[PDB]
Every structure is written in structure tokens, then in C-alpha cells.
Design a protein around this motif. Sequence first.
Motif, PDB file in Angstrom:
ATOM      1  N   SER B  39       0.861  -1.208   0.000  1.00 22.45           N
ATOM      2  CA  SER B  39       0.000   0.000   0.000  1.00 22.45           C
ATOM      3  C   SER B  39       0.887   1.245   0.000  1.00 22.45           C
ATOM      4  O   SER B  39       2.055   1.139   0.410  1.00 22.45           O
ATOM      5  N   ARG B  40       0.350   2.375  -0.458  1.00 22.20           N
ATOM      6  CA  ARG B  40       1.022   3.701  -0.393  1.00 22.20           C
ATOM      7  C   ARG B  40       1.196   4.109   1.072  1.00 22.20           C
ATOM      8  O   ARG B  40       2.187   4.796   1.385  1.00 22.20           O
ATOM      9  N   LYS B  41       0.260   3.690   1.927  1.00 20.22           N
ATOM     10  CA  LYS B  41       0.289   3.938   3.393  1.00 20.22           C
ATOM     11  C   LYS B  41       1.413   3.083   3.979  1.00 20.22           C
ATOM     12  O   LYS B  41       2.278   3.642   4.676  1.00 20.22           O
ATOM     13  N   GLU B  42       1.385   1.780   3.684  1.00 16.53           N
ATOM     14  CA  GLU B  42       2.422   0.788   4.074  1.00 16.53           C
ATOM     15  C   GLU B  42       3.811   1.419   3.899  1.00 16.53           C
ATOM     16  O   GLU B  42       4.442   1.742   4.925  1.00 16.53           O
ATOM     17  N   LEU B  43       4.242   1.631   2.649  1.00  9.81           N
ATOM     18  CA  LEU B  43       5.616   2.084   2.291  1.00  9.81           C
ATOM     19  C   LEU B  43       5.532   3.294   1.365  1.00  9.81           C
ATOM     20  O   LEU B  43       5.736   3.173   0.155  1.00  9.81           O
ATOM     21  N   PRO B  44       5.226   4.495   1.912  1.00  7.04           N
ATOM     22  CA  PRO B  44       5.231   5.728   1.127  1.00  7.04           C
ATOM     23  C   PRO B  44       6.539   5.897   0.343  1.00  7.04           C
ATOM     24  O   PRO B  44       6.494   6.325  -0.791  1.00  7.04           O
ATOM     25  N   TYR B  46       8.605   4.089  -1.268  1.00  8.87           N
ATOM     26  CA  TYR B  46       8.622   3.481  -2.632  1.00  8.87           C
ATOM     27  C   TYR B  46       8.209   4.545  -3.656  1.00  8.87           C
ATOM     28  O   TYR B  46       8.965   4.857  -4.601  1.00  8.87           O
ATOM     29  N   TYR B  47       7.022   5.109  -3.439  1.00  9.96           N
ATOM     30  CA  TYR B  47       6.319   6.012  -4.382  1.00  9.96           C
ATOM     31  C   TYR B  47       6.907   7.423  -4.266  1.00  9.96           C
ATOM     32  O   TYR B  47       6.583   8.270  -5.118  1.00  9.96           O
ATOM     33  N   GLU B  48       7.726   7.668  -3.236  1.00 13.72           N
ATOM     34  CA  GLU B  48       8.450   8.952  -3.030  1.00 13.72           C
ATOM     35  C   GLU B  48       9.724   8.957  -3.880  1.00 13.72           C
ATOM     36  O   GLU B  48      10.508   9.928  -3.754  1.00 13.72           O
ATOM     37  N   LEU B  49       9.932   7.920  -4.704  1.00 17.30           N
ATOM     38  CA  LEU B  49      11.133   7.822  -5.574  1.00 17.30           C
ATOM     39  C   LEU B  49      11.042   6.672  -6.590  1.00 17.30           C
ATOM     40  O   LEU B  49      12.113   6.146  -6.959  1.00 17.30           O
ATOM     41  N   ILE B  50       9.837   6.315  -7.054  1.00 17.49           N
ATOM     42  CA  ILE B  50       9.626   5.426  -8.240  1.00 17.49           C
ATOM     43  C   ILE B  50       8.584   6.084  -9.153  1.00 17.49           C
ATOM     44  O   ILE B  50       7.447   6.315  -8.692  1.00 17.49           O
ATOM     45  N   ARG B  51       8.973   6.359 -10.401  1.00 16.26           N
ATOM     46  CA  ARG B  51       8.198   7.181 -11.372  1.00 16.26           C
ATOM     47  C   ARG B  51       6.831   6.527 -11.604  1.00 16.26           C
ATOM     48  O   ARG B  51       5.821   7.095 -11.156  1.00 16.26           O
ATOM     49  N   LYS B  52       6.827   5.353 -12.242  1.00 15.24           N
ATOM     50  CA  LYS B  52       5.624   4.632 -12.735  1.00 15.24           C
ATOM     51  C   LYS B  52       5.649   3.223 -12.158  1.00 15.24           C
ATOM     52  O   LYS B  52       5.967   2.262 -12.850  1.00 15.24           O
ATOM     53  N   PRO B  53       5.335   3.064 -10.855  1.00 17.02           N
ATOM     54  CA  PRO B  53       5.337   1.744 -10.230  1.00 17.02           C
ATOM     55  C   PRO B  53       4.412   0.768 -10.973  1.00 17.02           C
ATOM     56  O   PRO B  53       3.670   1.208 -11.825  1.00 17.02           O
ATOM     57  N   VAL B  54       4.496  -0.521 -10.639  1.00 19.34           N
ATOM     58  CA  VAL B  54       3.652  -1.611 -11.218  1.00 19.34           C
ATOM     59  C   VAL B  54       3.831  -2.894 -10.387  1.00 19.34           C
ATOM     60  O   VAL B  54       4.971  -3.181  -9.966  1.00 19.34           O
ATOM     61  N   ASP B  55       2.739  -3.642 -10.194  1.00 18.76           N
ATOM     62  CA  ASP B  55       2.645  -4.851  -9.332  1.00 18.76           C
ATOM     63  C   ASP B  55       3.059  -6.085 -10.140  1.00 18.76           C
ATOM     64  O   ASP B  55       3.915  -5.952 -11.023  1.00 18.76           O
ATOM     65  N   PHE B  56       2.486  -7.244  -9.808  1.00 16.39           N
ATOM     66  CA  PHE B  56       2.252  -8.385 -10.732  1.00 16.39           C
ATOM     67  C   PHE B  56       0.779  -8.394 -11.146  1.00 16.39           C
ATOM     68  O   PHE B  56       0.510  -8.617 -12.335  1.00 16.39           O
ATOM     69  N   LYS B  57      -0.131  -8.174 -10.189  1.00 21.11           N
ATOM     70  CA  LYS B  57      -1.599  -8.090 -10.419  1.00 21.11           C
ATOM     71  C   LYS B  57      -1.864  -7.345 -11.735  1.00 21.11           C
ATOM     72  O   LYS B  57      -2.513  -7.930 -12.622  1.00 21.11           O
ATOM     73  N   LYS B  58      -1.326  -6.131 -11.876  1.00 21.75           N
ATOM     74  CA  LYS B  58      -1.575  -5.214 -13.026  1.00 21.75           C
ATOM     75  C   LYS B  58      -1.135  -5.863 -14.349  1.00 21.75           C
ATOM     76  O   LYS B  58      -1.735  -5.536 -15.399  1.00 21.75           O
ATOM     77  N   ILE B  59      -0.126  -6.741 -14.307  1.00 22.59           N
ATOM     78  CA  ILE B  59       0.437  -7.448 -15.500  1.00 22.59           C
ATOM     79  C   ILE B  59      -0.678  -8.302 -16.121  1.00 22.59           C
ATOM     80  O   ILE B  59      -0.912  -8.198 -17.346  1.00 22.59           O
ATOM     81  N   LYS B  60      -1.350  -9.088 -15.278  1.00 23.09           N
ATOM     82  CA  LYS B  60      -2.395 -10.070 -15.661  1.00 23.09           C
ATOM     83  C   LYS B  60      -3.651  -9.298 -16.082  1.00 23.09           C
ATOM     84  O   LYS B  60      -4.380  -9.790 -16.967  1.00 23.09           O
ATOM     85  N   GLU B  61      -3.878  -8.132 -15.466  1.00 26.13           N
ATOM     86  CA  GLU B  61      -4.916  -7.140 -15.862  1.00 26.13           C
ATOM     87  C   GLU B  61      -4.645  -6.734 -17.313  1.00 26.13           C
ATOM     88  O   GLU B  61      -5.499  -7.006 -18.176  1.00 26.13           O
ATOM     89  N   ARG B  62      -3.469  -6.154 -17.561  1.00 27.60           N
ATOM     90  CA  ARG B  62      -3.012  -5.716 -18.908  1.00 27.60           C
ATOM     91  C   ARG B  62      -3.106  -6.880 -19.900  1.00 27.60           C
ATOM     92  O   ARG B  62      -3.313  -6.612 -21.101  1.00 27.60           O
ATOM     93  N   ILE B  63      -2.941  -8.117 -19.425  1.00 30.49           N
ATOM     94  CA  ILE B  63      -3.199  -9.347 -20.231  1.00 30.49           C
ATOM     95  C   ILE B  63      -4.712  -9.468 -20.415  1.00 30.49           C
ATOM     96  O   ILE B  63      -5.184  -9.198 -21.529  1.00 30.49           O
ATOM     97  N   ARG B  64      -5.438  -9.797 -19.343  1.00 29.04           N
ATOM     98  CA  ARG B  64      -6.893 -10.112 -19.363  1.00 29.04           C
ATOM     99  C   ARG B  64      -7.671  -9.027 -20.120  1.00 29.04           C
ATOM    100  O   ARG B  64      -8.662  -9.380 -20.780  1.00 29.04           O
TER     101      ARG B  64
END
Lengths: 115, 115, 115
Positions: B39-44, B46-64
Motif C-alpha cells: 500500500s502507499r500507506k504501508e511504504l510511502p 517506494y512512491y516517493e522515488l519510483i516514477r511509474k510503479p507496477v505490481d504483478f496483479k496489473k500485469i495479468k490485468e493488462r493481459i486479461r
Amino acid sequence: LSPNPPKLTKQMNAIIDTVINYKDSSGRQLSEVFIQLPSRKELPEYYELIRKPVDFKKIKERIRNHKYRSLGDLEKDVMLLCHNAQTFNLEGSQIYEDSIVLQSVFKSARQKIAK
Amino acid sequence: LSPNPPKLTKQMNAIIDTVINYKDSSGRQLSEVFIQLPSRKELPEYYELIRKPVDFKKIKERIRNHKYRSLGDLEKDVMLLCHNAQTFNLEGSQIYEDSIVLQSVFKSARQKIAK
Amino acid sequence: LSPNPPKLTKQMNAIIDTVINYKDSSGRQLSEVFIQLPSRKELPEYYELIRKPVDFKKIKERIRNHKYRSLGDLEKDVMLLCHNAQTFNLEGSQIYEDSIVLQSVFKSARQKIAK
Ligand SMILES: Oc1ccccc1-c1cc2c(nn1)NC[C@@H]1CNCCN21
Ligand SMILES: Oc1ccccc1-c1cc2c(nn1)NC[C@@H]1CNCCN21
Ligand SMILES: [Zn+2]
Ligand SMILES: [Zn+2]
Ligand SMILES: [Zn+2]
């Protein structure tokens, strides 16, 4: 503390399913020896040393009959299962080893379905 | 001008299904931590220094949901993750190594899949 | 020496339908490819190699024509299905792995209703 929603029940299961049904790299379903305890008249030693015993059946039962209020309250009984297992078994023995692995599976399985 | 057919569906799935399930010499599936982001709450941070983050979930989304045209589309997402995971986590720090380990596993899974 | 009570017949169909119906974590019906064998003209191979070929349609057909006498008679055939898949298909080859999974579901369906 009123009627256990169906949504919450729907989780506990799949979690404890994810667990029970886990088969390792070789494919051995690790749950086998945790489902049913052995008998007082088979392994009296276990019930001498383990003050608060448990197996999976008796956890499934407690899901089935909405004893467990929160997912927390389940973890505890799954954790106490492994604690018990570890406590009884020789470190590095296949029984002792599985309990750990399972411990993790749950925590990831609960993670993967819970908050 | 045109759609995304069975080869692009099956193969791009086939590739990813494989990678996820890849387990090292210890039979440790290394996809584990890369399935669901913190989460963004969990580990801010990450997102305070990664441009365009991405999961694994989103990969299968972009597939499906049919966003990846060719293989070259997918890999870009795939390698990126690692790029991030490497960019964020420390050299030698398990995750880093895993992240690299993966990159290649895909590479073989892509190349091995010869039509 | 006597025909099959509808109590039994309706099990055989429940058990088998649990099986066929089953989807994996992903949401993927494993049954799919087993439902109907391939044509002789399409996999001459399979017929050379597999001694007594069987798929799911024919099992259904064999429950319908009161041809299975016990649940044994059934499981006997159901396992003949997976043996044949694992005999023909190479170890770790998706199909192979699936067949094994099903063997379990079937047994968990049956072990469920024997209670
Ligand atoms: O700790 C448990 C928690 C829940 C269910 C079962 C056990 C269990 C079973 C055990 C054993 N230790 N623990 N030691 C050896 C003995 C060899 N035969 C099978 C039975 N088995
Ligand atoms: O072993 C079986 C038992 C029952 C029904 C089907 C099969 C089966 C199907 C197969 C195959 N092997 N086995 N090889 C791959 C091939 C892909 N194209 C369709 C056919 N298929
Ligand atoms: Zn109830
Ligand atoms: Zn579609
Ligand atoms: Zn009839």
C-alpha cells in the motif's frame, strides 16, 4: 459479537483451504498428519506434554460453528497447532519442518485475502 | 486496426504462469513479494522515488484486458518491475537478487516459446 | 443382482460434477480438455499408446447407463482417465499436473459424501 457475516466465513475457509491443500515442490500435501490428531490410547505422550492440543478438523469445526470472531482468533489456533507440533517434534524432523512452512502459507494466504 | 488472438493470449499467459511458479534450488518461489505491492500507506518511500510503479496483479490485468500488443510490450512491463525492485531495494538484499533472477527466467520463457 | 438406487446414481453425478465444475485459484476449469478425447485422425498417437482410452463424457454416459456398480467402479474409471493423461503427457507438462490435481478433487468429493 452478532451473526458472523458470510463474507468473513468465506475467507476463513479459503485461507484454511489454501493451507490444508498446499502441496510442496515434490508435491506432498503437508497437511496430511495435522488433519486428525492421533489417539490418547495411541500416543499418550502427546497429551502428557501438550496441555492445549488441537488439529485442523477441530479448527474447521470452530469455523463451521462461528466460534472464531475475527481472523486474528483463527491465526492463534493455527499458530498454536504449529507451536504444539514444533514443541513435540525433533527440530529438522519432517513433521517439525512442515508446521513452519504451513505457518508461513497461512500468513501469506491470510495476507493475500485479508487486510 | 485489429484484435488480440489466441497465440497472444495463451503464450503471454503461458510465459507469466511459468515465471510466477519459478522456485530456486531451495524450491522458494521468488514471485511471492512481487504479486501484490505494499500500500502507499504501508511504504510511502517506494512512491516517493519510483516514477511509474507496477505490481504483478496489473500485469495479468493488462493481459486479461488486452493492452499488450506483442511480446515486446509485455517484457517492458516485466523488466521494469525488476528495474524498480533493483532501483529501490539494496544490492545483495534478497529481493534485488530475486528481481534479477526473475528477469532472465522470463527471458528463457519468452525465447523458449518459439511460436 | 439388482440395479442402482437413485441415492447412489445422484452421488456419482454430484461427485463427477464437483470435479468437472472445478476451477483453480486463477479461475481456470481444469476439466476442459478431458471432457472429450481428441479425434483418432487428430492424435493417432494417443490411441497407439493408451490401452483403454476414456474421457469425462463417457463416464457420465456410464453413470447414465447404470454401468458403474459401486463408487469404486467409478473412481476406478476416473483414475484410468488421469493415469492415461500422465502415461501420454510428459511430467510437469501442464495437462499432466492438472490430471493429478483432479485425482485429488474427485477423492475429496467422494471422501466428503462417504460421510
Ligand atoms: O502436532 C500435531 C498437531 C496436530 C495434528 C497432529 C500432530 C502430530 C502427529 C504426530 C506427531 N506429532 N504431532 N508425532 C509423530 C506421530 C507419528 N504418527 C503420525 C502422528 N504423529
Ligand atoms: O490424456 C487425456 C485424457 C482425456 C482427454 C484428453 C486427454 C489429452 C488431450 C490432449 C493431450 N493429451 N491428453 N495432448 C495435448 C493435446 C492438446 N490438443 C488437444 C488434445 N490434447
Ligand atoms: Zn451456520
Ligand atoms: Zn476478452
Ligand atoms: Zn436409467
